[PDB]
Ligand binder design. Structure first.
Ligand SMILES: Nc1nc2c(ncn2[C@@H]2O[C@H](COP(=O)(O)OP(=O)(O)NP(=O)(O)O)[C@@H](O)[C@H]2O)c(=O)[nH]1
Ligand SMILES: [Ca+2]
Ligand SMILES: [Ca+2]
Ligand SMILES: [Mg+2]
Length: 166
């Protein structure tokens, strides 16, 4: 069966771990335990095809930024996550995308831009602004809530599907 190496990246506290765990284990993590680097694997059927998701959950804390080159080298598709209630996290997205783009020596690396925590009402990043960023990269924008499960499967499966267009 095909195996897809997905990497989830973005600023700390945007909900990377919560997204991943919601996808893989089907529950919401309410507490905030900052991640160093964790791995998850799950057989899923996507568009008729049995396949293996290998998902790397990465550090948002910038002290662990040295570890980025290593996972950006290995990973096949990148979930680029900001929180819609954290403008700074949206501004941080570029640093992640550029580095992926640099490290992979490609302007065409499978990516999906994810606006997380769309259940919260304190939005400071309007959808249209994220859509504009995603358009410049030539990638999809998808809003998610790790809390309600809205968009969680869409976001990850779209990433698997971007890896398949490439
Ligand atoms: N309301 C709401 N809270 C969320 C959502 N996703 C994550 N959170 C909350 O935000 C906090 C941070 O979540 P977490 O997944 O650990 O963030 P992270 O991006 O993995 N952090 P790190 O980079 O340090 O590993 C947690 O308290 C979590 O419950 C979401 O969609 N909605
Ligand atoms: Ca919980
Ligand atoms: Ca504004
Ligand atoms: Mg985490």
């Amino acid at each position: 069966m095909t195996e897809y190496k997905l990497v989830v990246v973005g600023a700390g506290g945007v909900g990377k771990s919560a997204l991943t765990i919601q996808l893989i284990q089907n529950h919401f993590v309410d507490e905030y335990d900052p991640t160093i680097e964790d791995s998850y694997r799950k057989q899923v059927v996507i568009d008729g095809e049995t396949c293996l998701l290998d998902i790397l959950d990465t550090a948002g804390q910038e002290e662990y930024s040295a570890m980025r080159d290593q996972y950006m080298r290995t990973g096949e598709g990148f979930l680029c996550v900001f929180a819609i209630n954290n403008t700074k996290s949206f501004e941080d997205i570029h640093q992640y995308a550029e580095q992926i783009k640099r490290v992979k020596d490609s302007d065409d690396v499978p990516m999906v831009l994810v606006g997380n925590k769309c259940d919260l009402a304190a939005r400071t990043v309007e959808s249209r602004q994220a859509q504009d960023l995603a358009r410049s990269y030539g990638i999809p924008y998808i809003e998610t809530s790790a809390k309600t499960r809205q968009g969680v499967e869409d976001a990850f499966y779209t990433l698997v599907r971007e890896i398949r267009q490439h």
